[PDB]
Design a protein around this nucleic acid. Sequence first.
RNA 1: AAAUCUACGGAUCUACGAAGGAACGCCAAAAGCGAAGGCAGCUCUCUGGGUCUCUACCGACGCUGGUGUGCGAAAGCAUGGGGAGCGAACGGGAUUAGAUACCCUGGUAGUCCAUGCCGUAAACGAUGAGUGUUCGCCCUUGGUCUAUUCUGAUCUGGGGCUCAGCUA
Lengths: 75, 47, 101, 116, 128, 127, 99, 48, 90
Amino acid sequence: IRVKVFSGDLDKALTILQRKMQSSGMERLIKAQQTHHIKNSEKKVLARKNLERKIKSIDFARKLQSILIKKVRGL
Amino acid sequence: MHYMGLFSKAGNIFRQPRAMQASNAMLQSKIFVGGLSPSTDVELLKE
Amino acid sequence: PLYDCMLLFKPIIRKEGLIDLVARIGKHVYSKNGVLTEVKSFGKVELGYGIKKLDGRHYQGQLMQITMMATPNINKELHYLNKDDKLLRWLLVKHRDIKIG
Amino acid sequence: GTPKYLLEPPKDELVQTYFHPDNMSSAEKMKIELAKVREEFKMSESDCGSARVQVAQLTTKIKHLSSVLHKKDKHSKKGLIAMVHRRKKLLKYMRRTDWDSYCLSLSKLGLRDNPD
Amino acid sequence: GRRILNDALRTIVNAERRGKASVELKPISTVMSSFLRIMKEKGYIKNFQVHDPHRVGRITVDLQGRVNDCKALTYRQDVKAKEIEEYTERTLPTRQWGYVVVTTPDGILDHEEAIKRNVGGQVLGFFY
Amino acid sequence: SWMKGDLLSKTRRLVGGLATREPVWLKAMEASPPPVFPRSNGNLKKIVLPEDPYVRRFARKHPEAKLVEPNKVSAFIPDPARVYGCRVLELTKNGISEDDAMSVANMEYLAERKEKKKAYKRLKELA
Amino acid sequence: LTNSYSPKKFRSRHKKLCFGPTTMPDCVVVFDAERKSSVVLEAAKLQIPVVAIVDPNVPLEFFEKITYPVPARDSVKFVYLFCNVITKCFVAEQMKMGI
Amino acid sequence: EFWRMTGLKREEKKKARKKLLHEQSSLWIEPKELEKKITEALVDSTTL
Amino acid sequence: KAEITTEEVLKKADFRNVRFLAQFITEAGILVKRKQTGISAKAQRKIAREIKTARAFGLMPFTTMGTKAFTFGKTMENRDQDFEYEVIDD
RNA sequence: AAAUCUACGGAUCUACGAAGGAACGCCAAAAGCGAAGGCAGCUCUCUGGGUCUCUACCGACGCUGGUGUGCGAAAGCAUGGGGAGCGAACGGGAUUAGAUACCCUGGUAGUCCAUGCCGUAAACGAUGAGUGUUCGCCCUUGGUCUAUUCUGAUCUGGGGCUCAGCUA
Ligand SMILES: [K+]
Ligand SMILES: [K+]
Ligand SMILES: [K+]
Ligand SMILES: [Mg+2]
Ligand SMILES: [Mg+2]
Ligand SMILES: [Mg+2]
Ligand SMILES: [Mg+2]
Ligand SMILES: [Mg+2]
Ligand SMILES: [Mg+2]
Ligand SMILES: [Mg+2]
Ligand SMILES: [Mg+2]
Ligand SMILES: [Mg+2]
Ligand SMILES: [Mg+2]
Ligand SMILES: [Mg+2]
Ligand SMILES: [Mg+2]
């Protein structure tokens, strides 16, 4: 991902590059790079733990948004 | 049974009450993230 | 069955070479008792990367498509195109009812 | 709105060579051959699922598969064994139900008799 | 007959425990109709109706909440006319309430009538 | 406890055997027993009207139309769709082709809308 | 109700101090649809009749302890109508004894 | 008779496919018209 | 957002319609997920298979890290005009 | 924390080119398929099974199954190839009171392909196969019908929560 800098504003170019590396999904894959080898029997365990964490976050965000949207829209 | 089946042949008696229609309008994919909705609840809703 | 043969010629191959190779494949089909229903060309295309051969790297190519009704064994003896020097890539696919263009 | 092929005269020899059975796949050939062998063994005119019809189709499928199937492919030879045992079950049914149909099937398809 | 008979009886008990009003049984049999007639006479079901009994049968039964368990035997059980009461004292769980339904030359009877008629046969099942 | 039965039967069985003293509410419960209703097979039938298909399009027909509930009226004054469906049920009631009945109901609804509009115009005239 | 004789202590303004009933009630009339209190459970534990208005989504555990169910949606008009019938019936009974 | 009604409509559908293939046969390629049609396709050179 | 429908995808998805298939790659050259287009699982399977076939045929990039962004119709060469700049500011 | 190792015979780094082997990122997963073991780049050939619809055929032809037969992760064995990366055994450097280990550096058999052998696993849902019945709610794979522009219904497998019921 290449970003041109205009008028010598390096901070704007770096922010644009960071956001584009974010929204292209390449930051997720660049953090998902492994240093060692993991077997499939450990990939299953890590995926299960990921799923449990995701379910807990879904419940938290559901309850938070419900109690926000009850109050905010005239109630 | 007799009377309720009679009164179905009348005006619109199957009208949703205000509370049920308001909950339907309250409800109408996924949600906002926790770190986003918490920032919204940290900035606003303190009144 | 009904096949589409897609060929990607090198950018420097000229009209006589294109006609010679397409006529050779057509004569193959006629010898193996097939029907040629549609020949068409997409002109010069742009590739997503540089295709690398013995001569160098190429970034544009000429696309040809031939529609045929031939034997099921047609792809087994279309394997002489892998060793062809006017070709970049070749691919025989089954026919799909999708408009192209 | 008229397409271009509605002007020129059609070609008869090309549409004749279009449908030559060297241009069709093995599944289409098998469908045609099974539809042929159904009609010899049907009892009624609409009959397509009686026991001797199923036995004739299963014998054709077994004779095709036993030659075509690769030795290293073990996932389809299980289906072939399933075909063999279903044919045995249908013959066992016919031997006590209809002796005429049992004798007709054995004589025409060239199989042997087993009471075991 | 024993598999479908036990099937319909367990359907009846399972729907009794849910507090329902009607049950539908399919496939049916004449033995099953006679068993249901015995249940109606003893007062464990209110009514039963048989529909299309010579092509594809279905039976509708109306329930009232009075039957505790119905069993049909899945094996052969002979009984003579003088073994009925001793067999009944060991078949029913309470040894007082419930009826053993046997099949006889005189028809499909319960255990109290077959003592009076002095005829034995095959035990079909019991309800209590 | 481990007794069986509901409140009235359990209490009656308890006070018959001199286990507990008689509560005060026992006589009122005996004079006015709780209600009973027959068995129901657990099935609820979805209530439907014959005018339902004509009500349907009536939101497409005369597109969105009247609303007499936000305008809190009463649960007896019909709601446009209801009167349109009643007219076409009794209209088609007399043989009349279905689409022709829809046309002649549509025309009279639009004539009613023109009548309402000129009523509002004369309201502004005497205002 | 199950502990109506426990001591109370004065602390502050609080939510105000209130003791239990001196006399055990003979009937409990409930207007709880959100099930905020344990009154049905305590009355079932202490064998007291309960008159309450039942929702379509009432649990079986709470429903089976209700002696006199009144199936309705507790709107303001129906709550008024219910209480009006109760009050008129009670005062008409009270007048028959000269009171 | 219901089987006969279904068997005709399936035979009806198969035949009209062959007729449409027959009237579409006028644009196929003869071996004596191979090179002419190749050159004419190269002249046309449709878009991507 | 851009409106795409499962029926539209099932009619247009082919490895020769590179212009239509370029909707479903990011600037890193990787494939868009299903949840941010709303199409069905069959549509996503067809899209992924056709983009893979086009990548093997050479019409689409395997990855665009270290190269320019892929848009349809122009070259993927690394010419001298990729890094044109300005000097009049200094 | 270091050392062995490697590098002035020019290493690491940077651009282009060549060779060779193995595995197929994004899609992507409480998804899908298979009797189980298992199965992931793409195109073609051949083949096994499954689901839906029918005012189509046939007519109980079904279920389970000792003795038997077949399939069966990985490691291992025999013959012939291949060998990038990883890596039992083994060499060296450290750590320690000792260190036949954990850590570092090299690295053979093996992992890969063709043809055969063995027939075992925490081969696990620690839950044999099959049949009938039992209140619901929320998702989802593949279909079909109806739609009234957004939805309802009915099959098919996969998941989350629960009335009863059961449970030390
Ligand atoms: K299956
Ligand atoms: K079997
Ligand atoms: K649970
Ligand atoms: Mg499965
Ligand atoms: Mg191995
Ligand atoms: Mg070897
Ligand atoms: Mg090591
Ligand atoms: Mg050592
Ligand atoms: Mg090494
Ligand atoms: Mg074992
Ligand atoms: Mg396993
Ligand atoms: Mg077993
Ligand atoms: Mg579905
Ligand atoms: Mg299901
Ligand atoms: Mg419980």
